[PDB]
Amino acid sequence: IFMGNVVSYLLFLLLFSRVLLVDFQPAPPGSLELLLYFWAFTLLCEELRQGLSGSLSQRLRLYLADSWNQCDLVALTCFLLGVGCRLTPGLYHLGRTVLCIDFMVFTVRLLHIFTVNKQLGPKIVIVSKMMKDVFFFLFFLGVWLVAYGVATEGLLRP
Amino acid sequence: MFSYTFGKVQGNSDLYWKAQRYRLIREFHSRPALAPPFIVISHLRLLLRKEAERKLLTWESVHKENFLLARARDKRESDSERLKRTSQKVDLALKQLGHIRE
Amino acid sequence: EQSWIPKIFKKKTCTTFIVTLCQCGRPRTAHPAVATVWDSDAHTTEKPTDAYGELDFTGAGRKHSNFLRLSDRTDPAAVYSLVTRTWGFRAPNLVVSVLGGSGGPVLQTWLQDLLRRGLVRAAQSTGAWIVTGGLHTGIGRHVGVAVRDHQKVVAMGVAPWGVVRNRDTLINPKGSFPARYRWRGDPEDGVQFPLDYNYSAFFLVDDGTHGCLGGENRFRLRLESYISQQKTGVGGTGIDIPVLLLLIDGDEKMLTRIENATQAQLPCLLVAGSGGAADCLAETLEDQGEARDRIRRFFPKGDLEVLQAQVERIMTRKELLTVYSSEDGSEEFETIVLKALVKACGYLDALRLAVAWNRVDIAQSELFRGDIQWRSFHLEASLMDALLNDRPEFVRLLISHGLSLGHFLTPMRLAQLYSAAPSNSLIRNLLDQAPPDVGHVLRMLLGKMAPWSDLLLWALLLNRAQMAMYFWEMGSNAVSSALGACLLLRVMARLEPDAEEAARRKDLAFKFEGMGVDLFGECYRSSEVRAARLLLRRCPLWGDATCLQLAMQADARAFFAQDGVQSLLTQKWWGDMASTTPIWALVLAFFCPPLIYTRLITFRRCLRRWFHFWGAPVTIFMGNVVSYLLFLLLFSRVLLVDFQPAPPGSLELLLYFWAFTLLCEELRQGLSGSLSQRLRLYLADSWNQCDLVALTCFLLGVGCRLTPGLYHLGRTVLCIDFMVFTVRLLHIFTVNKQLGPKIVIVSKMMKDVFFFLFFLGVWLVAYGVATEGLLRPRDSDFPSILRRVFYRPYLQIFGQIPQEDMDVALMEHSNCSSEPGFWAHPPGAQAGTCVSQYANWLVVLLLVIFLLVANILLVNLLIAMFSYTFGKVQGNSDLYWKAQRYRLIREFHSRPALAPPFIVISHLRLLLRKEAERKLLTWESVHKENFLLARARDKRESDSERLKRTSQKVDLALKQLGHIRE
Amino acid sequence: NDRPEFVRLLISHGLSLGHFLTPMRLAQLYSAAPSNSLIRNLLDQAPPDVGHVLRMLLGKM
Ligand SMILES: [Ca+2]
Ligand SMILES: [Ca+2]
Numbered sequence A: 001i002f003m004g005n006v007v008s009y010l011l012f013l014l015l016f017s018r019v020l021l022v023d024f025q026p027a028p029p030g031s032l033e034l035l036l037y038f039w040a041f042t043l044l045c046e047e048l049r050q051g052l053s054g055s056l057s058q059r060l061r062l063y064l065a066d067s068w069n070q071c072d073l074v075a076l077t078c079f080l081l082g083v084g085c086r087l088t089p090g091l092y093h094l095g096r097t098v099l100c101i102d103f104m105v106f107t108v109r110l111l112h113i114f115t116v117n118k119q120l121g122p123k124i125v126i127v128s129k130m131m132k133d134v135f136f137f138l139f140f141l142g143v144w145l146v147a148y149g150v151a152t153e154g155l156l157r158p
Numbered sequence B: 001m002f003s004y005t006f007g008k009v010q011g012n013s014d015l016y017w018k019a020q021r022y023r024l025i026r027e028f029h030s031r032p033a034l035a036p037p038f039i040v041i042s043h044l045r046l047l048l049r050k051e052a053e054r055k056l057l058t059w060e061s062v063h064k065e066n067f068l069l070a071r072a073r074d075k076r077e078s079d080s081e082r083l084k085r086t087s088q089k090v091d092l093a094l095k096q097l098g099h100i101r102e
Numbered sequence C: 001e002q003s004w005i006p007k008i009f010k011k012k013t014c015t016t017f018i019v020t021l022c023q024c025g026r027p028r029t030a031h032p033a034v035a036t037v038w039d040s041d042a043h044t045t046e047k048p049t050d051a052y053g054e055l056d057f058t059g060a061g062r063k064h065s066n067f068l069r070l071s072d073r074t075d076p077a078a079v080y081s082l083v084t085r086t087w088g089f090r091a092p093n094l095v096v097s098v099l100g101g102s103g104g105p106v107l108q109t110w111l112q113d114l115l116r117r118g119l120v121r122a123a124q125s126t127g128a129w130i131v132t133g134g135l136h137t138g139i140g141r142h143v144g145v146a147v148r149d150h151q152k153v154v155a156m157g158v159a160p161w162g163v164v165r166n167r168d169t170l171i172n173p174k175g176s177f178p179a180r181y182r183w184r185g186d187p188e189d190g191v192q193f194p195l196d197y198n199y200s201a202f203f204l205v206d207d208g209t210h211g212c213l214g215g216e217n218r219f220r221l222r223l224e225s226y227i228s229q230q231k232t233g234v235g236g237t238g239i240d241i242p243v244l245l246l247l248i249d250g251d252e253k254m255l256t257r258i259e260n261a262t263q264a265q266l267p268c269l270l271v272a273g274s275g276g277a278a279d280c281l282a283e284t285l286e287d288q289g290e291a292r293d294r295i296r297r298f299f300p301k302g303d304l305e306v307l308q309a310q311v312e313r314i315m316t317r318k319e320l321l322t323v324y325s326s327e328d329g330s331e332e333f334e335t336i337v338l339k340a341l342v343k344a345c346g347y348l349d350a351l352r353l354a355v356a357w358n359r360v361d362i363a364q365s366e367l368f369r370g371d372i373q374w375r376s377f378h379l380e381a382s383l384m385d386a387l388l389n390d391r392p393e394f395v396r397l398l399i400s401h402g403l404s405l406g407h408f409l410t411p412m413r414l415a416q417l418y419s420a421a422p423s424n425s426l427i428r429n430l431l432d433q434a435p436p437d438v439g440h441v442l443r444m445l446l447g448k449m450a451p452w453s454d455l456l457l458w459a460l461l462l463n464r465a466q467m468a469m470y471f472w473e474m475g476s477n478a479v480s481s482a483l484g485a486c487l488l489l490r491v492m493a494r495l496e497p498d499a500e501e502a503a504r505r506k507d508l509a510f511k512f513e514g515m516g517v518d519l520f521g522e523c524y525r526s527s528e529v530r531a532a533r534l535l536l537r538r539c540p541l542w543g544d545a546t547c548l549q550l551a552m553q554a555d556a557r558a559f560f561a562q563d564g565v566q567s568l569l570t571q572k573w574w575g576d577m578a579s580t581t582p583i584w585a586l587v588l589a590f591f592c593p594p595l596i597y598t599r600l601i602t603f604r605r606c607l608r609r610w611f612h613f614w615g616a617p618v619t620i621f622m623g624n625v626v627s628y629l630l631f632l633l634l635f636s637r638v639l640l641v642d643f644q645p646a647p648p649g650s651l652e653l654l655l656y657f658w659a660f661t662l663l664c665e666e667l668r669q670g671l672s673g674s675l676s677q678r679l680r681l682y683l684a685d686s687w688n689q690c691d692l693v694a695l696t697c698f699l700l701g702v703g704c705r706l707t708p709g710l711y712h713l714g715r716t717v718l719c720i721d722f723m724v725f726t727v728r729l730l731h732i733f734t735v736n737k738q739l740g741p742k743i744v745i746v747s748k749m750m751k752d753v754f755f756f757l758f759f760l761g762v763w764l765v766a767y768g769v770a771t772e773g774l775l776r777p778r779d780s781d782f783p784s785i786l787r788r789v790f791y792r793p794y795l796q797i798f799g800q801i802p803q804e805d806m807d808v809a810l811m812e813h814s815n816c817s818s819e820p821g822f823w824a825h826p827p828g829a830q831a832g833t834c835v836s837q838y839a840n841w842l843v844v845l846l847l848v849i850f851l852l853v854a855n856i857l858l859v860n861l862l863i864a865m866f867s868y869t870f871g872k873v874q875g876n877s878d879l880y881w882k883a884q885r886y887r888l889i890r891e892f893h894s895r896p897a898l899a900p901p902f903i904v905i906s907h908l909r910l911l912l913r914k915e916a917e918r919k920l921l922t923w924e925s926v927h928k929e930n931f932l933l934a935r936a937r938d939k940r941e942s943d944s945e946r947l948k949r950t951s952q953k954v955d956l957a958l959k960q961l962g963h964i965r966e
Numbered sequence D: 001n002d003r004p005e006f007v008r009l010l011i012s013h014g015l016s017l018g019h020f021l022t023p024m025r026l027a028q029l030y031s032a033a034p035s036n037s038l039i040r041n042l043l044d045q046a047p048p049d050v051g052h053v054l055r056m057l058l059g060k061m
Helices: A002-023 A031-052 A056-064 A067-087 A092-115 A120-129 A131-156 B002-008 B010-029 B039-046 B051-076 B079-101 C004-008 C076-086 C109-126 C138-150 C217-228 C252-263 C279-286 C289-296 C305-316 C333-345 C350-356 C360-368 C376-388 C392-400 C411-419 C426-433 C438-446 C451-462 C465-473 C478-494 C499-526 C532-536 C547-554 C557-561 C563-573 C583-591 C593-597 C605-615 C617-642 C650-671 C675-683 C686-706 C711-734 C739-748 C750-775 C782-796 C840-872 C874-893 C903-910 C915-940 C943-965 D004-012 D023-031 D038-045 D050-058
Strands: C010-012 C046-048 C053-055 C065-067 C069-071 C095-098 C129-132 C154-160 C201-206 C243-247 C268-271 C321-324 C812-814 C823-825
Touching (some): A031 A056, A092 B010, A120 B010, B002 B010, B002 C840, C109 C129, C129 C217, C138 C154, C201 C217, C217 C243, C243 C333, C268 C333, C279 C321, C289 C305, C333 C350, C350 C360, C350 C376, C376 C411, C438 C478, C478 C547, C499 C557, C557 C874, C605 C617, C650 C686, C711 C739, C711 C874, C840 C874
Parallel strands (some): C095 C129
Antiparallel strands (some): C010 C046
16 A cells, blocks of 8 residues: 555646646646646545544544655645636736745655655654754854855945 | 764764654555545545453563563572672671670 | 364263262263163263363463363373374473372461462472362362462362362363352252362263262373472483472371372372371381371271381382471471372483473582592483583583493494484574584584584584583683684575574674683783684684684674774785884885885895885885876876877877776685686676776776777766776775775765655755746756756756746847747846746746745755765664775785786786694683683672572571571 | 552552442542642533543644
8 A cells, every 4th residue: 555655646747747847837728637637636626635633623633643654635725726826817827936845745744655764764753853953054154154144245335 | 073073963863863763654654545646535435424351461471570580599699789788798797796795 | 183082082971870859960860861889980981071161260371271071091101192293281300199098178387388388389490390189179279379479380280180170161172271160159068069270171071970089090190100200301311201290198098099109100108197097107117006096097097007017018119208397497308299299200310300390509518528429421311411401501411421422422433412403493494405414514504615613613603602602611612612612603694485484594604703802802912923813814624714814704894993902904915014014104115116225114135125125015005196196197198189080009008908907806706716606796886886897887988989980989988987997096095094084974975865865856846947948948948947947046056046937037138039928138148039028026026935945045954965965874883894904915915016017927826826832722722711700700709699699698697596496 | 549569559459440439539539630730621611521622632633
């Protein structure tokens, strides 16, 4: 079941890219785009099933507590928003941009695959724990960039 | 910093992964057998809708008794416990020696 | 399996009536329709038993105290079989049938101390059974409380059915596996008693009576006799189980029971000072007789001549009777039992019995006295018993007594020893598949590609750690035997159905490897010219395979790690040249052949030196390296310059011939180094796989080149083949003491590499597709799309950031496309004719995030993972390199002395075609003895052992102090 | 009185435990909760009535 799910998700990403790069046009959606809409709807139904069966509020919170479920939910929300914007006559470009970001959100989900390997799962956990060091570096670099950039801009006087 | 953190949280991360492995397996144990593109056909199906045990417990109890006996024997044969027993026996010998001296 | 229990066991009914009240203990009213002197057998009926199962005393207990109800006239063989097999009780090495009325609930302090310290302790030590009355009264209660205080011990209780309180709750014809018994019934009358809760199993003898005493005596005596007729395990090898009766106090009934037991040839132990019916016999044995009977025994029947006649009949067989000397409470039970059994005996030996028990001190005392004079078979039988029952200490002691072992072991005895394999054990299966016929199974395990040796092999096969250890200590070829034992144990472990059994074999193999390495270290540090140069390089009787071969097959990395073996391998690597020769000296000699004869290199005489220099593995390796470098140089020269569509030139033909010679060399390596077996062995090496793929690509490229139409394809294939060939040069660093471990660690870094690659691939796909979608370049060509989606983002990781092709601020605005919106014209060739500029700040933001993640976070994470892995697998990699060093040296030891370009001339040659040893073994044995003595002394002087000895000495002093105080 | 050794020894003497424990005895045992202890508070919030507090702690989900 896991392997079939992985293969289907890879095919879904392939179709999403195919639609986004080629078949996405201001005209009304084509056959492939409608297939993508149906596929995303089935993914939404699957997430709904996972949340619903897995004390309604209790199990809903239990489902929403998982990071991967949060990622799936945000991806699907962005997809719905992008489709809505695209269908509207005036918000075509905004919809395309939202879907472009949503593709990144969907693709990041593939990292879940490595949680099954005996060696990669611990690596992903450690990576998740590296974020304090990442933030320290980012804050230090931001301070340094502000200082240096403002000093140089003031000196040059463009 | 990355090197230090990676070296520091190796064991805890491994334990955490081993723990959540059960959650992963259980999640994929209950999912529909079909893929998301076709999973609609299965969500539709979901919609519209002893003596052996006693023997097992007895065997478990036998193993528990063996484990407890092993722990007790290991503790009793430890150096600290043997030293304590020797001290008590020496004290008993000393008391009997004082008693006989009278 | 219980339905058979009712089939073979029967209970008794009141049946016929004998007078108001039945003579069968039941009221005349409560009798069946069928109801002079009532008969326990004639006036009763037998029905299937309906009170079997096990007892679960409420709360405490082992949750299992097997019970049973059976007729008195029952054959004890069935009872013994049921107890031994069905209920799981092992065969008793000794049975103590405790007797004694012990009038009055209270018992003397010394008697209670003896029971809790002499009897119960001995029973637990020897795994004996204690047979008493399964009731909470009389001596049974005292025995039970002694057992409880000592606490397990097996206490069988044979009691009548009818005097047991709450007999109703036990009745369940279907079975009573969960049985609940309330031994604490409020009424307290002598008619019935409660079953004690300290006894492991009960036998409720049924004689068709509702209360009586002595009705079970017949069955008890019959069971005692039958047990005394059995054997002490190991099939018929064991001696007859000793069954003796212990008596404390008593009465005329006890005297009759003692008489019956003596008639049954059962030793009796009479406790001195126990009381009446026991001190009477003790005094009679020690030495008016009627006066003794009157004073000691109760006044009734004292003047009766029956008592005196019974005492006379008892003394008629006084050999069986023995008095437990008070000795101020000696509490030395095992020795007294042994003395009583010896006296009764007047074959059965104290040695065999001591071996049956695990008491080696008792046998040590028995043999230490010079009074006993032993013969050959006498000790041989005991040694066989010790071997069969896995008693290493006893075999050590027996061998220590000058027992000749060469004549002891015989094909019949060896067959018996192997026959003792435990039920369905791997050794048993292998023997069945294959007299012992051990050679066939040994060859099957290894593949086939002196009593001590045989006994060591047997112990290894049966996996008896201590016995195999001892046999190795007494063996001749210590180091080779240790390595062979490690090999055999590892092979068996890999071949075992159950992992837990395999782990024991694996641990034993590890222990043998440790002993082998320690002993060889001792031998080497004593004398290097011997030991390594001779012990390792000789071919023993194991498989006529040198110890190094055994270590290689066993994967005994620890054995290769030690400095002695490494120094020997280095010495073999340099051949006859001194191991200290500098590398530069070797190079100079290689390029200046005459300089070999100069004193600057240290070792017909001329031809001898010539062949010594050019045959050493190191010089062959250097020549091979030089030839391979020249081959790569020629390959590059051909590929870059002389490769043309025209027919091959001279240099290209030379390259073809050179590659052909390399192919022939690989063929030779695979062929000579069981055709399929050696082929797989060759193909298993990674370097051989690399060579094979390189040569296959070379053949494919040459074939394509020769074909008129596939010239370019051939050139491309050869271009890749050059990379494949060049990668082989990494094999050079496997010889350096520092680089080889590095290469091993590098090979182990691939998991981290793959993690990084997968992460980077996911990130690249996401970012590239997002950027391509945002820009909307109008090329929209599949190769161009793939380029912009994968290649360009990938190159951005290495500082190749084409801002002009992504940032609209750096491009020229133009109305390229008729589609609505604003567009810009990138200057890049493959950047798309024009890109949308709707939200370009988002493209720049994605570029910023991608640079951050990829360049910094992922790369630094990979560095951290590499650092961790490198630090973690240092030692294992070093050991692995030290182990494979032998394979490298052996491979280069057998190669032709000529280089691949000329190796054809040598492949052609290949085609068309003591007392010193005994002295060496003796010296090895001396060193082994020294090493074993050192280990034993170090263990004895350790703090833990000294503390244990002090505790024992303190206990001895305490016992002597208590003794003197009296 | 929290004397594990004594309870071990007493049980070791063939004391029948099934008949020993009774609802009154269990109520007494739970009544021995020390003054204001978490168990005491939970019992007050909820005879022992232990099942309810057990479900509350576990949640009975
Ligand atoms: Ca999910
Ligand atoms: Ca090769």
